[PDB]
């Protein structure tokens, strides 16, 4: 489909060999479409553009779905992967998207228009992206809850 990539970070890692050092570039890339599908990927190569290529190819296997009632997440949720945490809150209409570095990319490539968020834990980009993905995975719509609990949509609320 129509995918928009966005490099989040590029890092230059190194390993020590008997003759000195060896350097490799690792790229983190978040891809997705503005309709509600988004994923992330990590690639590593001895050259940056090939690192982005590997990252986008890896990312193309980890789509998720973001329930986005009225261009807004249904409710607040905390993602707690690894050592990092992200807190997401629904926001008023036309308020924009306010977020840190990579969580902004994740929430903007998914098509969510209005949301608030705060990085309550660490600031490593990989862990922030993973925590945001977990928090999104903890999201459920009113229709689904009504179906689960028997009560219809209106009697639910």
């Amino acid at each position: 489909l129509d995918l928009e990539e966005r490099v989040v970070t590029i890092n230059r890692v190194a390993k020590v060999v008997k003759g000195g050092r060896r350097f490799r570039f690792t790229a983190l890339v978040v891809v997705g479409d503005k309709n509600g599908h988004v994923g992330f990927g990590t690639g590593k190569a001895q050259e940056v553009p090939d690192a982005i290529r590997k990252a986008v190819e890896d990312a193309k296997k980890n789509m998720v779905f973001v329930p986005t009632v009225d261009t807004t997440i249904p409710h607040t949720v905390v993602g707690h992967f690894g050592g990092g945490e992200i807190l997401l809150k629904p926001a008023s209409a036309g308020s924009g998207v306010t977020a840190g570095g990579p969580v902004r990319a994740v929430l903007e490539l998914a098509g969510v228009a209005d949301v608030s968020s705060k990085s309550l834990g660490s600031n490593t980009p990989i862990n922030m992206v993973r925590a945001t993905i977990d928090g999104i995975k903890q999201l459920k719509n009113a229709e689904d809850v009504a179906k689960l609990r028997g009560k219809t949509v209106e009697e639910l609320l």
């Binding site: 209409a93 036309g94 308020s95 924009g96 998207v97 306010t98 902004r104 228009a113």
Partner: protein, 199 residues
């Protein structure tokens, strides 16, 4: 006006043809300065919001203090913040004087309004920031009706918007209703403005 200088440079730097018909970018559509043809640089995230903000205050030509003040007082009305911010920027007397066709650029309309040639609902007003409401009538003071520049300002009229009304026999116009972002502007994301000012 308040900022006096070349006008093609600002449009070239921002990347749109603000206040024009593309006349600022047919030849040399690249940024000014010694550089500009030499190289192009990737934009950071801060630069994106900065550009989308300078794209709007340079369009209507008002300084930063007024810009943030009108942003804050627009934030009080019911509805969407960016929309209401960009609608009551179209209610400045300069905007209506330009839209009717009594000037060729917003600078010309501002300079016309300063010198007192335009009377709002019968009373002469000498300031360019008077927010006009719906149902008020605008004239040309009846003492400077037959001037050259204002007469040729109708020779290149860009056709009145749908939310105004104007006639040339009485040289009189009025604001009909309020615009709704489906009539004004097409190259500006106001959500970027709200992000920049809500950091």
């Amino acid at each position: 006006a308040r900022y006096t200088g070349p006008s093609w440079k600002v449009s070239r730097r921002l990347g749109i043809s603000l206040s024009g018909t593309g006349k600022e970018l047919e030849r040399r559509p690249y940024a000014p300065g010694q550089h500009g043809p030499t190289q192009r640089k990737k934009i950071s995230e801060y630069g994106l919001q900065q550009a989308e903000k300078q794209k709007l205050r340079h369009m209507y030509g008002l300084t930063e203090r007024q810009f943030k003040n009108t942003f804050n007082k627009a934030g009080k009305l019911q509805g969407k913040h960016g929309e209401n911010f960009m609608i009551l920027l179209e209610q400045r007397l300069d905007n209506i004087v330009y839209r009717l066709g009594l000037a060729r650029t917003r600078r010309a309309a501002r300079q016309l309004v300063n010198h007192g040639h335009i009377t709002v609902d019968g009373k002469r007003v000498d300031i360019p920031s008077y927010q006009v409401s719906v149902g008020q009538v605008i004239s040309v003071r009846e003492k400077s009706a037959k001037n050259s520049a204002i007469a040729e300002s109708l020779e290149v009229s860009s056709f009145v918007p749908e939310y105004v009304t104007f006639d040339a026999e009485t040289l009189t116009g009025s604001l009909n209703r309020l615009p709704e972002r489906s009539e004004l502007a097409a190259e500006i994301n106001e959500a970027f403005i709200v992000e920049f000012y809500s950091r």
